[PDB]
């Protein structure tokens, strides 16, 4: 079962729905791969800091509060 979900999980129809929510009329077929990349970068940025928060708690588990801390400062800057 050869495909890997991390790219594929975010998929043309869902992207279309996001664009429609964003009021987009029409889209080039190229767009999706840009957005996946951008999404990875965005996600990558936040989760790294959540990891480091979890490290400072020395806990194995990551809470929504750690997410809130990383997302708070990172979201305001971005």
């Amino acid at each position: 079962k050869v495909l890997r979900d991390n790219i594929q999980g975010i998929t043309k129809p869902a992207i279309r729905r996001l664009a429609r929510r964003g009021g987009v009329k029409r889209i080039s077929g190229l767009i999706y791969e840009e957005t996946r990349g951008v999404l990875k970068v965005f996600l990558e940025n936040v989760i790294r800091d959540a990891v480091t928060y979890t490290e400072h708690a020395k806990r194995k588990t990551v809470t929504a509060m750690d997410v809130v801390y990383a997302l708070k400062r990172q979201g305001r800057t971005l």
Partner: protein
């Protein structure tokens, strides 16, 4: 008060030939204060989240990893470790 003396020390260590404009040194003096505030702010936030009364090497060590990009962070953090260990033994 100023860091200018230490700025000169590090400058002569890294580029003993060079001099600096006092304007540029003033830039450095503002910069070091900025980074000192930013790191202290994150240290405070971490301590508060963990209900700690105190700031330790552990707090600043982790916070640096939050301020700096990862390669600069890796150098900074390992240099800090070496420094604090040398202080511990001496």
């Amino acid at each position: 008060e100023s860091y200018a003396i230490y700025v000169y020390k590090v400058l002569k260590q890294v580029h003993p030939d060079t001099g600096i404009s006092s304007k540029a040194m003033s830039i450095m003096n503002s910069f070091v204060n900025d980074v000192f505030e930013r790191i202290a702010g994150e240290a405070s936030r971490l301590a508060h989240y963990n209900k700690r009364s105190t700031i330790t090497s552990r707090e600043i060590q982790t916070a640096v990893r939050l301020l700096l990009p990862g390669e600069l962070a890796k150098h900074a953090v390992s240099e800090g470790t070496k420094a604090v260990t040398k202080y511990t033994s001496a």
